[PDB]
Design an enzyme around this catalytic site. Structure first.
Site: not given
Lengths: 281, 281
Positions: A72, A106, A110, A200, A203
């Site tokens: 990301d 994002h 993670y 996602e 995007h």
């Protein structure tokens, strides 16, 4: 570039009204409405789950996370240095502004996951610098990074490449985690995976919409190549470097899923499917 | 630039953990927690209020809005093209990512206000392109724009200039609208003004924090000049181009408030006050 409504000089660029592209505007509004923060993901009941996992299963997930840890960031770095700068259309810049904001969330998410599962500092650093330690992820990242530095490739080609990065490069790991959700495991991992994927998909759709707003863009054959290259890299990643077998998945059905996702992109882009295979899941 | 922890090359740039600067991190978290959307501002009961207003009062507010309509866009444009690109520290880029997202919401909000109050298209276009029609706002915007194109001025100087843009250039109009809130008028205008200012204060504090994280930055005298220049421009704006008298305000107390805000910035920056005047409100 002067004949490109998307890239040509725009004096009204700094003001939002009157809206010029409602299609681009609605894309941004969908993203806005999807806002969430990492804090919203409860990871309290996940260390134990990570414990129960099998040595092979953790090896998998840890490696999937290794790649997501910087992916990301790489995307955001392209958005800042290129896309958001290149595009002069107000509504598009709004979408890209929110995408940047969401990519960082994002990215945070993670890091939290990894922080939550791996207590050993040695391993932590190892996974956090996977683009410099894990050749498995090194290849994918380098592929993405190249499109950022490529001062020759057009926005058309580059937007297609990142549509692949955000779609095809996410697809494999996405399905694997969805698989765990099915098997009822890692509620934190699977919950954030659902939120992230919703972003996602957005995007990716947007990338395709920008593509459509481009007048002079690459030919179909060139788009098929870029997409196909990403597909192969992703398959190699999840059948060789990190076989989905480790978590009880058919390496063959996974390879097919990636192609299915690739085909979805092509359609969204306005072209014919490449593989013509149904979703194996 | 290689001795600058903030601007020097960073390989870990793409990953969020481990956090390197908790001070920068907490700044970003405060911003995150302040998230809001234009939709959240109810403007249903505001057209009538705009009606009740006096011809002079509307002339004022309309012009204040004319400047706000593009101001946030200009800021975002500097963040994208410069700041977010220049800065290599992950936590800083997260703050700038969210600032970009919020500036666009701010931008949307001002457009809505104008859309809500001015039904006449002629005037609408006039105010929407104020940086090309209203010399009153043309000066302020050009001042800001110059710092974006200035390929000589250092990040230190430029971050100080935008701290002035987001603080001093917002101060005058902010106080005026707060004044209306006091007089119980334009509930939409005053409500969004409160939200926006909360973000603005954050954008300003951050700018000063980045300043502190800079090793080689401009000398005090140079900072006093940049700040003082902004102060004068803002005073000229609200006592000449658009006198606060139009809404029942003492042009002299307004001039003092701006200096007070200027002094607050200097302190935040780590220097001594310039004017040494109390807040007249």
């Amino acid at each position: 570039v002067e004949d490109e409504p998307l890239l040509r000089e725009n004096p009204r660029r700094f003001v939002v009204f009157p809206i010029e592209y409602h299609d681009i505007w609605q894309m941004y509004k969908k993203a806005e409405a999807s806002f969430w923060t990492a804090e919203e993901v409860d990871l309290s009941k996940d260390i134990q789950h990570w414990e129960a996992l099998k040595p092979d299963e953790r090896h998998f997930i840890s490696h999937v996370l290794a790649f997501f840890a910087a992916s990301d960031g790489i995307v955001n770095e392209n958005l800042v240095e290129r896309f958001s700068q290149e595009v002069q259309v107000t509504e598009a810049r709004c979408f890209y502004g929110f995408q940047i904001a969401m990519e960082n969330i994002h990215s945070e998410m993670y890091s939290l996951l990894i922080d939550t599962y791996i207590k050993d500092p040695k391993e932590r650093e190892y996974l956090f610098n996977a683009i410099e330690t894990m050749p498995c992820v090194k290849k994918k990242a380098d592929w993405a990074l190249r499109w950022i530095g490529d001062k020759e490739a057009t926005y058309g080609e580059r937007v297609v490449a990142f549509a692949a990065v955000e779609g095809i490069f996410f697809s494999g790991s996405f399905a694997s985690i969805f698989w765990l959700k099915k098997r009822g495991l890692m509620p934190g991992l699977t919950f954030s995976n659902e939120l992230i994927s919703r972003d996602e998909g957005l995007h990716c759709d947007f990338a395709c919409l920008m593509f459509k707003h481009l007048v002079h863009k690459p030919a179909e054959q060139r788009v098929r190549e870029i997409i196909t290259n990403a597909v192969r890299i992703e398959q190699e990643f999840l059948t060789e470097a990190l076989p989905v077998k480790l978590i009880g998945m058919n390496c063959t059905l996974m390879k097919q899923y990636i192609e299915f996702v690739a085909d979805r992109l092509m359609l969204e882009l306005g072209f014919n499917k490449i593989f013509r295979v149904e979703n194996p899941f």
